[PDB]
Every structure is written in C-alpha cells, then in structure tokens.
Amino acid sequence: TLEVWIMPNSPQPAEDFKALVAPFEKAHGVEVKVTVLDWGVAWTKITTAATSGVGPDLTQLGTTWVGAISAMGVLEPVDDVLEALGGEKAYLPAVWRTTRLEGARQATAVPWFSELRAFYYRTDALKAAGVNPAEMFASWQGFEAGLARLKASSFRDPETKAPLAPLCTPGKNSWDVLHNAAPWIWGAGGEIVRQAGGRWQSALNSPESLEGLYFFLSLAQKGYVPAESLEKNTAQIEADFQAGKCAVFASGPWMIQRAQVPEAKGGFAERTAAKNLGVAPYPAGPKGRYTFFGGSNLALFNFSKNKPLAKELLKYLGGPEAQVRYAQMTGMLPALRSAWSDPSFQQNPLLRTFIQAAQFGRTYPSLAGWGGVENLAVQHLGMAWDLVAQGRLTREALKDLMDKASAAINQALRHH
Ligand SMILES: O=S([O-])[O-]
Numbered sequence: 001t002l003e004v005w006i007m008p009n010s011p012q013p014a015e016d017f018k019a020l021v022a023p024f025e026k027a028h029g030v031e032v033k034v035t036v037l038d039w040g041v042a043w044t045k046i047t048t049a050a051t052s053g054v055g056p057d058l059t060q061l062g063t064t065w066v067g068a069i070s071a072m073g074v075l076e077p078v079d080d081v082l083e084a085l086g087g088e089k090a091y092l093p094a095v096w097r098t099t100r101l102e103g104a105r106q107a108t109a110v111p112w113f114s115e116l117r118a119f120y121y122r123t124d125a126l127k128a129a130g131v132n133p134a135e136m137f138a139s140w141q142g143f144e145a146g147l148a149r150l151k152a153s154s155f156r157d158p159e160t161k162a163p164l165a166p167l168c169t170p171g172k173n174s175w176d177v178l179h180n181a182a183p184w185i186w187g188a189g190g191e192i193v194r195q196a197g198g199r200w201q202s203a204l205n206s207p208e209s210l211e212g213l214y215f216f217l218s219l220a221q222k223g224y225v226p227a228e229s230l231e232k233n234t235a236q237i238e239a240d241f242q243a244g245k246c247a248v249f250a251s252g253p254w255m256i257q258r259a260q261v262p263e264a265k266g267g268f269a270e271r272t273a274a275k276n277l278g279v280a281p282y283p284a285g286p287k288g289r290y291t292f293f294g295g296s297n298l299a300l301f302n303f304s305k306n307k308p309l310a311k312e313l314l315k316y317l318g319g320p321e322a323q324v325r326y327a328q329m330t331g332m333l334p335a336l337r338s339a340w341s342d343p344s345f346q347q348n349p350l351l352r353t354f355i356q357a358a359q360f361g362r363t364y365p366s367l368a369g370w371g372g373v374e375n376l377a378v379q380h381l382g383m384a385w386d387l388v389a390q391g392r393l394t395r396e397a398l399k400d401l402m403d404k405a406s407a408a409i410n411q412a413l414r415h416h
C-alpha cells in the first residue's frame, strides 16, 4: 500500500485526495493511504522523515521547500515522470523552476497545484468612485489614483451603510509579508535575492527593490489602508471583504467558489460583495508586470520500497484529468498548464482573469537555503510595516532596515 503525506489543501483534505486517486486505485488494484499534516508541523515531520528514513512513499512539499529537501539527498529523481507529462513546455517557466534545486539538471519534485494572487475588487464601489478597473490595475500610477478616488468616494456599502476601506492588506511578520511585497519589488525591477559578483546576495536594499517596497508600504501611510488591516491575516481580511468593509484586496482564486456558496453553507453568495465581484492582475511597475506563484509539488523519498508504483501515482496526480479534478476541490490553479483550457476555468470570467494573471507568474529562486532567506526577509519587512503603523516609514528608514536585512541574508547565504 502506498502512503502519501498531504497538507490541508481542500475542505475535507483526506476525503478529496481519496476521491481523486479512486480511479488509480481501481486500475492498479491498490488502496493509497493518506495522512494530512497541518501546515504548522508539516515541515518538521517531513525533515524527520528525511533524516530517519521513516516516512511515506510520497509527500507534498511547498514549492519553496524543494531546494532544502533536495539538497538532503533523500528525493528520487523524477525527470522520467516530467518527460511523461510533456517536459519543460508542459509548465509555466516559474512552475518548472520549482521542480529542482536551483541549477540542478535533475528534477526532484512534480508540480501539483499553483497558488497565485491577483486583486479582487468591488465592481459597485469602483463604478461609484468613477474608477475604470482596467486602468486602476494596469499601472502603479493608475492603482494609487484609483485608491485616492476610492478614499474620496461618498459610496457606502448597501448592507454596512458605511464607507469601504480602499485597500486591505496585512502587515504581520508572516510568510504572506514577503509574497504580498514580491510583485511590487519585482515590478520595480528588483529582487529579494540575485546572483551578482560571483555569489547569491540580498537585493532587498537595491534602489529598485526599495522603490517597489516604498510604493506599496506608503499606501498604508496615505490613508488608503485602515490601521486595523495591518494586524489581520489573509483569512480575516477575506472575511472583511465578504462583509462589505473593503473595496480591494489581494488573494488567490479560492474566494471565487465561495461567492457562489450560500451563507447557510459557509459561503457569502448573499453579500453585496459576492454580486459585485471583480478580479484584476497586479499592476505593472516601471520594469514589468509580475504575479506571485507559490503552491505545492509532490516528491518521492528515495528510501521508499514502492518507487515504481509511486512514480505511476506521481504521473497520475500530475496529469490532465487529476489536475482538472483536484482544482474543483482546492480552488487552486492546476500546475499543469494544459489543464487551464478546461471549460471549468475558461467559462468562468473570474478564473479566466486568474489565467491571464498566470502569464506573468514568477517564483522565488529554488535555493537550498531559501527558508533562512525568507525568515530574515519576513522579520525585517515586519519591522518596516511596524514603522507604517506609526506613520514613520521614510525612504531612509526603509533603506536602513533593508541594509540590515541584506547583511543578515548575505551572512546566511555564506553558510550551508
Ligand atoms: O536588526 S537585525 O538586522 O540586526
């Protein structure tokens, strides 16, 4: 019997995964056993399995974990599976980069599903503020002009009878800090880390990265983000948006499904926000348009005693039918680019816009030491948000924080 470890990807995560593999089980005449790891403990459990040799056949891995676990020497090469699924041209480039440790020419993980983020907006609020959505979400200048108009607007939510916040975004020292910043960094022409001068180094303190960071964080100093937003997580901001408190916020495609679910079943179909829902990609910066991608991949431990059957299950879970099916349950975009043509996506205007957003997808570099980089970036970005909460983020203060971040990161990148 094969054993798979997964994270809570869908509302009934084990059940959905079992329904997903039921045809594979029938064709191979096996049961696949599943264990669900909470996102909190998943990494600890997976590293304990890597060090001990005691674990599942397959594990889910977040895309940013691939480099670290690969570098431990515990993953089976899966170039054969990826060739079977269509090779490099079967994936968005940003997704293909998540199949390996950066600069390896051997794949160790199979793309499973993508998490990308775009802006949701209140179509009624923008109509009432006189804001063209295409031009608000096309450029930085359009975006900040749109928030200005939304702040000035006399519009009130029909249900709350109160104004809407122009923009809600969190400012907590969580991993979401870095992916909410990344499109602004990238659109300015910056990066979190880059190769330069023969080494990997932080680029958080580059003029371009600082430009992007300051543009975004300064919106919360201009009155466009309510103070209360800064200490909420993405779940709480999503609930504020559903409750008619927010004109604009960034998230993945899951909320699209929930706008069709009645409040009696855990959704928000009856709320004004569900009936007046738009999506747009992140605006272009001066140096280009980028959409953050994350999500999850699958990997096979090389200590598995069922590698041949495990490889057949990776091809199954990576392939068209299972990619389309699982997306109905996760609300996430398939990792397999072919699957985006399915009518389940193309006949839903809001999902078609996420697929437009996908063309601009970009991932973090697949470094073995990525988690140490991310922790240091998150902590220092959280200090910049904390200055925002005081109305004291200046460009020089932001630069000094990112200078400290860059020294810490540069030191982390020198050890292995
Ligand atoms: O604040 S830490 O970079 O020393």
Ligand SMILES: [Cl-]
Pocket: 191, 192, 193, 363, 364, 365
């Ligand atoms: Cl980067």
